[PDB]
Design a protein around this ligand. Structure first.
Ligand SMILES: *[C@@H]1O[C@H](CO)[C@@H](O[C@@H]2O[C@H](CO)[C@@H](O)[C@H](O)[C@H]2NC(C)=O)[C@H](O)[C@H]1NC(C)=O
Ligand SMILES: *[C@@H]1O[C@H](CO)[C@@H](O[C@@H]2O[C@H](CO)[C@@H](O)[C@H](O)[C@H]2NC(C)=O)[C@H](O)[C@H]1NC(C)=O
Ligand SMILES: *[C@@H]1O[C@H](CO)[C@@H](O[C@@H]2O[C@H](CO)[C@@H](O)[C@H](O)[C@H]2NC(C)=O)[C@H](O)[C@H]1NC(C)=O
Ligand SMILES: *[C@@H]1O[C@H](CO)[C@@H](O[C@@H]2O[C@H](CO)[C@@H](O)[C@H](O)[C@H]2NC(C)=O)[C@H](O)[C@H]1NC(C)=O
Ligand SMILES: *[C@@H]1O[C@H](CO)[C@@H](O[C@@H]2O[C@H](CO)[C@@H](O)[C@H](O)[C@H]2NC(C)=O)[C@H](O)[C@H]1NC(C)=O
Ligand SMILES: *[C@@H]1O[C@H](CO)[C@@H](O[C@@H]2O[C@H](CO)[C@@H](O)[C@H](O)[C@H]2NC(C)=O)[C@H](O)[C@H]1NC(C)=O
Ligand SMILES: *[C@@H]1O[C@H](CO)[C@@H](O[C@@H]2O[C@H](CO)[C@@H](O)[C@H](O)[C@H]2NC(C)=O)[C@H](O)[C@H]1NC(C)=O
Ligand SMILES: *[C@H]1O[C@H](CO)[C@@H](O)[C@H](O)[C@H]1NC(C)=O
Ligand SMILES: *[C@H]1O[C@H](CO)[C@@H](O)[C@H](O)[C@H]1NC(C)=O
Ligand SMILES: *[C@H]1O[C@H](CO)[C@@H](O)[C@H](O)[C@H]1NC(C)=O
Ligand SMILES: *[C@H]1O[C@H](CO)[C@@H](O)[C@H](O)[C@H]1NC(C)=O
Ligand SMILES: [Ca+2]
Ligand SMILES: [Ca+2]
Ligand SMILES: [Ca+2]
Ligand SMILES: [Ca+2]
Lengths: 443, 443, 443, 443
């Protein structure tokens, strides 16, 4: 279990609206990395997932022997060092290496262990969208007492509805007895979902002022952005997978898709917990290149999640490198299928302002360039501007995904955020996933 | 505990004299590294120590926050991956961060845990040699059941005899109920040790053929090489520290110095176990730049180690970068105080030939250059030549210490050696200690 | 169920056209044989059939007590050994010994067990062709829960149409709810089948360049090759038997003959599964002595197989020992009735080239001689040449049928092929059916 | 469970003294072999162990990949074929392949499964005798419900008493709640066992009439035959290992050595069950080259085996190939260390004659030659002559160990004996262990 200095500073909004205005990033602090490195120049470690909770943390990433498989799992606690800052102490390690190609895995903390959700890849991504059958889905529970239970799940409404289903790779969350995971995939034309989603679209609140197209043109393009001709003519859908914490899971997990009137085209994502509220981060793999965060309201019918609703925190801040007419400078609706995973952590409560998210502050990392996965930069920002930032390495430095997480030392009363970034390395391995850590200072 | 595939392939001579002649190194294999990385550009991780035994392994290294402290400890088991090669699974982690400057630590496996030996540094190395008082010594026992017992030891014959005492940083060994650690330091003039060591010297068997000085000149210079005017005019001594496995250690550990007629000037080192025989690796910090390995015979008087004797395995292979008239090309006796730690693992038994070590084969890493810590290269070699080698990275690549360890997969019947090398990194940290792993093929 | 290392490497094309060009056979590996041996010098074990699927494998062969009956059935899973290679673990054995002379049996894997198809022999083969009545047909289902259900089937269009009907002995396949088995026999003159097949013939694409007869002469001879005067003046027909997976089968199995415009004279054969496509191997018992493989397209009318279409993979590689003017050196059409069963496994997808099968790669075993069943040799070959081969035993070594099957270890990422060959033995039994296994290396 | 035709014909004396006189061997019958074959020319399958009981049978043998490791285990039942003779139906298979070198394994049937006893070899046999420490011992229980429990046992009175301990490789037996295994090894000079065994010797009853030395010379030589200077100067001891049927065995198994006044020098062996009496077969690895069988009387003190007593069945029949002055023609006491394992099954009760074993009849296989492991021959014999025999293969045919077992078909009322012989093969593998089966006819 985590040290008393952290058990009460996890999964919360740490600053008040007023304080958020005076927040800045401190120097990067040096701690022993809990994320394993490759031991060959061509080894590839990618797609990390990190979950932290009151009692402990869970970590995992994919390992491919030659170029960019096995799945490395880690788990432990946080404890203070004599310098005052954290040390992620690993208490158990696991390496799922057995021939099953588990990919796009999302991990979540659960009482006594970690629950991981992966899908079994057996062909190029695109082929998964064309094949009417969905890839195999698996949820592995790994207890700290070293028991391991892996199950091949078959949730209702997936077969013959989703041509593919993938976990979002971002952390899932343990909520009211269930483990929720972000998911996405392609839905088949003619299905109820497809029909119920028909004619729906979502346009971020700050698009109008920045887009040059008219309201009617924008609406038409936005509607079309949820369908991909390149990916088997499927409706790219974002959603949540809810599994009850059991060791005999089969078809009890439920697929809850987001309404396309509240969310953009399906993509990778992450689920958060700020107090009793669930939040969702949706990668911007469509036309809008800015950070997308939503407050998720979950409805339970008879002790079972029956529907989800998402409210976007309106921003125009922190763009992501895209390709073509969907670079970080795009502002107009249309169909796009490019981007990067770059989640953000809300240091301030969006519900604290009279108008939801009118003044929000978040932190994370992003690749500062319009079309290249280059110039990784850690930052703090509000809805319209970046109020603090520090690029890592010299310009041209290649990077990829970035998972950010913050917690507070209730002893010293300071917030530390960990920025897990995939860095292109020149010495060992294709990428080196680094758990950068620094403080978020008030002043 | 280690997997059944390794429990019977540890601490042994794996090949016969005949087989050693046809051994070559395989490609480097990619496994998740169990050695933690720095998270800042200037963070320094150095001085590793690794001990592997039938049941498990222990690992540790020093961490300094800005440039080249805290001590990271790790422990776990070995298990096969679906590719056939090993995966060092960490089962527990520890970070000794509390203000005590533990340095030059050596670690050893012990039943149920790890025993580490460090000294507390409070001033520049040189000052330790001038001060008549020796630094404080500590042995920490860390059990897998998470109990930790640290003791400040005071072995007899240290106070007022040794101006300084340091662990060799190389792994110690658990032998017949005792934990043995390599040690070295400076002895004060006028002491019994100094007197008993008076006029003693050691000249490697293959020096004559390579040295141009005459037998009388060589003898005179060799005698003088054990005294350093730069390090407080002390006799630089190599030796072994033997501690009985107890949780209340005070003054039961015994300091057993090597006779200077059998060993070169004191330096860092490592202890090994090949079956029932103990072996010692002595860093070449003096005039002779080649790998020094000795078969150690331990004498017990009344259940207590009373004396050690060392027999050198004669070689002229694998030089180490030195400074001035003590580069890798030096062959003549004199006083030197330069070099690097580069241990070697004996893949063949030296006692198997009629004349001890007439045909020996060893493997390890070495810096291929005469005076610079550059061009790290993993190799296999006999007494006079390198029969297999592969440099890592492009020329100019900086590196430092290298700790090598081999074991066998009794399932697939192949030997794997792990080459832990301190690599100068350009991205994260001053150095990146990497646990390179590859196979030693017969053919 | 099979180990996770194989569940996803079964019934697929393992290499790309480009990779197929650099494939070679590895050394034979030693595993415990799952095929039972005779215990007397004259005992005869012959005619094996092997089916492997995602979950498990099925095996069977005929046993005759004195010289060349009972039917041995076996079933199990595949699991890795500490050497990395497979071990076919038998989980159940059966010996059908009850007075019913079940011959020419083909076996196929089915969910939860094996389905075997045999015919009851009561007289010399030739007599079966002269008698207007067809031998009795039986399909036995053997569940892993040890239930056994044998049925005497009577499919429509057999009585008074086929003077005889035999399973091809090669494995059948479980496809979309039905079990398909290769069949062959003789059709009576004057029947619809005979009439619809009238004037049809098939000439392999690579015959012209190798045959010296002119297009008109070849066509005439090919037409006549489907009729045997020696076997009761019947049209020797090849085909597929499709049975729905039921325990009360009577007349629901359907006989689907191949068009004689797409296939050569009827003979033994085997059915395969490469992804969602069905393939057929037709023994060369007629004039063309080279390996015959066809991609089978199955048409369903009202949930029932209604017609099959076959597309040949054009080759001139891997000949088979024949008699007279039909040796391995024959290239001209005519009537022949000699050959051996020697199937081949496609390591490459024939549909991957713009022109179907323009560059195909297959592996298997063949008897390297023109007219004798001698010199068994395992090989890898493309359409025109053998790119890798290794003969077994010394020249003159007698052998017979060869059934080849390949799968992949998704853990180590290597393909293993099993070459089941009937070997003439000198010690125990007439033949020793051996399951040779080796790897197919890329490089 | 076995068929009703055999459940009541196992582990008994099948013939009366009078009937034994008219017994002859029938022709070898052909059944599917339940003993797996090697799949490479150099693969080595050796050292089989077979246990048959009322309910089922257990089988196992050692597998070495190149030349003469893993351990193959098999288990099943016996059922009649339509020819009337048996068919050993395998119901489960296991392959212990994990890097642990389990050798000299003995197997025994136990309720619900098989219990196997092996020792872990890590060095040449001879070295085990010189090292004061005994090899590691293991007993593996394998249940038909597929549970497997392996334990590293440490019975009292082994450490520092036996320099080595090996199972006899012959089948053990389940007796009154305990599993008994034959064992042998070398005892250290100066131990209680050594002292209690001092001056003891055993001379077979029929030696005098055949030996030319006098009673005093014979006694002196016999005493010395229990000590081997070649095997570390140890007393070669034969004995029984008794383990209570538990899944948590540690030190409950008991080592019960035979008195050297009743048994010859230690060697491999087998334990039998004839009704309620236990019998022991001791390989003739010493001076006397004839078959050694003893009726074992076991004493229990407080529900625990406390002592064993052996009564020899006096014979001079069925010699075994030995080396030097210990060939099959030797009859004089002295020290020898050569021979072969060739057990025998008692078809007649030795206690049925007024004088124990005055007229005994046994069957088995033996190598008919004086010093070579050649000419395997199955036979039936009384104390002084071979009344029936049939050699296998042509002269010169190499073979090795032979394990014989008989049971009765209470339905047809005939006895079948299975002769498991290691045959040197020319086609596949070094040896082919064959389960020959034939009937023992009365008339
Ligand atoms: C490790 O912890 C888990 C979690 O408590 C244990 O899981 C229990 O497993 C049994 C069946 O094996 C279930 O009936 C219990 O309900 C589970 N507990 C719950 C509610 O989580 C697991 O057994 C533990 N490992 C052991 C046996 O030491
Ligand atoms: C995000 O932060 C920026 C920078 O702090 C805010 O911009 C400032 O707005 C105040 C008005 O409240 C002006 O006095 C400053 O001059 C602005 N800074 C400059 C020079 O850019 C911005 O308003 C914030 N966005 C919100 C309201 O959340
Ligand atoms: C963790 O393991 C160690 C090693 O067994 C335990 O150490 C024992 O400690 C007590 C005093 O606390 C000694 O008297 C024993 O002799 C020690 N055992 C020996 C011989 O090593 C330690 O107690 C264990 N931790 C716990 C209490 O769970
Ligand atoms: C160390 O290895 C080298 C290289 O294998 C040995 O040198 C070879 O010695 C043999 C004689 O035994 C010669 O036939 C070769 O020509 C030598 N190799 C070459 C060309 O350098 C060397 O002898 C070995 N050192 C020993 C004896 O341990
Ligand atoms: C062994 O498995 C088979 C396959 O499931 C069982 O077969 C069932 O048999 C009943 C009639 O006996 C049918 O009505 C079911 O439809 C069959 N199941 C199907 C659909 O395959 C068989 O009963 C099992 N053996 C037992 C009874 O344990
Ligand atoms: C089958 O394999 C053979 C051997 O690899 C191919 O023949 C080679 O063809 C290339 C041209 O692509 C030539 O450069 C080589 O010289 C040929 N090898 C020799 C010397 O025989 C053959 O073309 C392959 N058949 C196909 C096209 O599938
Ligand atoms: C073992 O069997 C042999 C052969 O049957 C016995 O020898 C026979 O003994 C009888 C006397 O009872 C003579 O009439 C025969 O002539 C002997 N057979 C020959 C010609 O060798 C022998 O006695 C048996 N051994 C015993 C007594 O167990
Ligand atoms: C942050 O700093 C500003 C400027 O120094 C100060 O006016 C403001 O009150 C601070 N915010 C709070 C309330 O912490
Ligand atoms: C090693 O290889 C050489 C050359 O192929 C061979 O002659 C030698 O016997 C091998 N060494 C051994 C005995 O393994
Ligand atoms: C196979 O080997 C050849 C020759 O080394 C190489 O050129 C070719 O690229 C390889 N094929 C592939 C793409 O795997
Ligand atoms: C065995 O055969 C002999 C000779 O035919 C006969 O005299 C004897 O009674 C038989 N033994 C018995 C009693 O079965
Ligand atoms: Ca799909
Ligand atoms: Ca000092
Ligand atoms: Ca007929
Ligand atoms: Ca020993």
């Amino acid at each position: 279990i985590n040290d008393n200095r952290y058990i009460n500073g996890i999964n919360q909004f740490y600053f008040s609206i007023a304080e958020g205005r005076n927040l800045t990033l401190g120097p990067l602090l040096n701690m022993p990395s809990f994320i394993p490195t490759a031991t060959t120049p061509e080894g590839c470690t990618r797609i990390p997932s990190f979950s932290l909770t009151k009692t402990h943390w869970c970590y995992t990433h994919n390992v491919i022997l030659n170029g960019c498989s096995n799945q490395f799992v880690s788990m432990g606690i946080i404890e203070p060092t004599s310098a005052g800052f954290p040390f992620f102490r690993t208490l158990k390690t696991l390496y799922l290496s057995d021939g099953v190609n588990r990919k796009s895995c999302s991990i979540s903390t659960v009482p006594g262990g970690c629950m991981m959700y992966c899908f079994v890849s057996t062909q190029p991504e695109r082929d998964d969208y064309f094949s009417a059958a969905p890839p195999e889905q698996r949820i592995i529970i790994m207890y700290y007492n070293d028991t391991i239970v892996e199950r091949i799940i078959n949730p209702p409404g997936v077969l013959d509805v989703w041509a593919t289903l993938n976990p979002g790779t971002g952390s899932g969350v343990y909520y009211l007895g269930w483990v929720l995971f972000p998911i996405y995939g392609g839905v088949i034309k003619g299905t109820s979902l497809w029909n119920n989603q028909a004619n729906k679209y979502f346009i971020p609140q700050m698009v109008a002022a920045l887009c040059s197209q008219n309201q009617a043109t924008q609406v038409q393009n936005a509607k079309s952005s949820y369908y991909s001709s390149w990916f088997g003519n499927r409706m790219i859908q974002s959603g949540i997978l809810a599994c009850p914490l059991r060791q005999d899971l089969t078809n009890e997990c439920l697929v809850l898709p987001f309404s396309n009137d509240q969310v953009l085209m399906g993509a990778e994502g992450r689920l958060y917990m700020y107090g009793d509220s669930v939040y969702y981060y949706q990668r911007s793999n469509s036309w809008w290149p800015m950070t997308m965060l939503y407050k998720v309201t979950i409805t339970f019918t008879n002790g079972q999640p029956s529907a989800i609703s998402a409210q976007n925190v309106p921003t125009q801040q922190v763009p992501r490198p895209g390709t073509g007419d969907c670079s970080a400078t795009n502002r107009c609706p249309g169909f796009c299928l490019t981007g990067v995973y770059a989640d953000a952590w809300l240091l301030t409560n969006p519900s604290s302002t009279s108008t939801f998210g009118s003044e929000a502050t978040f932190t994370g990392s992003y690749l500062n360039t319009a079309t290249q996965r280059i110039n990784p930069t850690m930052y703090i920002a509000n809805n319209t501007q970046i109020i603090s930032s520090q690029q890592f390495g010299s310009s041209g430095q290649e990077a990829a995904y970035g998972h950010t997480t913050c917690f507070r030392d209730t002893g010293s009363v300071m917030v530390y955020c960990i920025y897990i970034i995939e860095l292109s390395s020149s010495l060992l391995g294709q990428f080196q996933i680094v758990p950068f850590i620094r403080q978020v200072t008030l002043s």
